[PDB]
C-alpha cells in the first residue's frame, strides 16, 4: 500500500542518512591508505536500522534495516563508492583501491536488490556491489533503483 510505502520509504532514507558516518569512514580511510573499514564504529542501532557495515577491501557501505522496515533477507541497501580514473577530464570510474593514498572526492552510488546495472553520469558506469543488496527498489530513494 502506498502509506506503507511511505513509512518504509521515510525509515530507509533515515539510514541512508545515518550512513554518512560510513561514507566519512571511508572517505578519511582512503586518504590516508588504510582499510577502508579501520576505525569505523557503526552509530546505535535504531528500531529501523539492524546495522551499517563497511566492507574493508572496497569501501562499500552494507545497511541492514530491521523487520519494521523489510523482511530479513530483503532487508539490505548498499552504497558503492568511485573515484575517477583521473581527477582531470576522466574517462571511467574505477573502484576504491586498499592501500593507496586517495584525497579525492568519492561518489557513492546507491543499488537497491531491483538494481542490475551502474547508472551514474560521465565519466560513466561505477563499479557493482560487492555483496548484493536485497532491499526491494520500491522501498529506496529512486536513485537506488533499477
Same mark, same amino acid.
Given at each position: 500500500?502506498?502509506?506503507?510505502?511511505?513509512?518504509?520509504?521515510?525509515?530507509?532514507?533515515?539510514?541512508?542518512?545515518?550512513?554518512?558516518?560510513?561514507?566519512?569512514?571511508?572517505?578519511?580511510?582512503?586518504?590516508?591508505?588504510?582499510?577502508?573499514?579501520?576505525?569505523?564504529?557503526?552509530?546505535?542501532?535504531?528500531?529501523? $536500522?539492524? @546495522?551499517?557495515?563497511?566492507?574493508? !577491501? =572496497?569501501?562499500?557501505?552494507?545497511? #541492514?534495516?530491521?523487520?519494521? &522496515?523489510?523482511? %530479513?533477507?530483503?532487508?539490505?541497501?548498499?552504497? $558503492?563508492? @568511485?573515484?575517477?580514473?583521473?581527477? !582531470? =577530464?576522466?574517462?571511467?570510474?574505477? #573502484?576504491?583501491?586498499?592501500? &593507496?593514498?586517495? %584525497?579525492?572526492?568519492?561518489?557513492?552510488?546507491?543499488?537497491?536488490?531491483?538494481?542490475?546495472?551502474?547508472?551514474?553520469?560521465?565519466?560513466?558506469?561505477?563499479?557493482?556491489?560487492?555483496?548484493?543488496?536485497?532491499?526491494?527498489?520500491?522501498?529506496?530513494?529512486?536513485?537506488?533503483?533499477?
Amino acid at each position: 500500500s502506498a502509506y506503507q510505502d511511505y513509512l518504509a520509504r521515510s525509515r530507509v532514507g533515515e539510514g541512508l542518512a545515518l550512513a554518512a558516518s560510513a561514507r566519512l569512514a571511508v572517505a578519511e580511510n582512503a586518504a590516508s591508505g588504510n582499510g577502508f573499514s579501520g576505525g569505523y564504529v557503526s552509530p546505535p542501532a535504531t528500531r529501523n $536500522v539492524e @546495522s551499517i557495515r563497511i566492507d574493508d !577491501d =572496497t569501501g562499500q557501505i552494507a545497511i #541492514a534495516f530491521t523487520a519494521r &522496515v523489510a523482511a %530479513a533477507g530483503a532487508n539490505t541497501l548498499v552504497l $558503492v563508492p @568511485s573515484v575517477p580514473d583521473q581527477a !582531470d =577530464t576522466p574517462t571511467a570510474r574505477v #573502484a576504491l583501491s586498499k592501500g &593507496v593514498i586517495q %584525497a579525492g572526492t568519492i561518489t557513492w552510488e546507491c543499488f537497491a536488490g531491483d538494481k542490475a546495472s551502474s547508472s551514474l553520469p560521465a565519466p560513466g558506469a561505477g563499479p557493482m556491489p560487492t555483496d548484493a543488496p536485497t532491499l526491494a527498489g520500491k522501498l529506496a530513494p529512486p536513485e537506488c533503483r533499477a
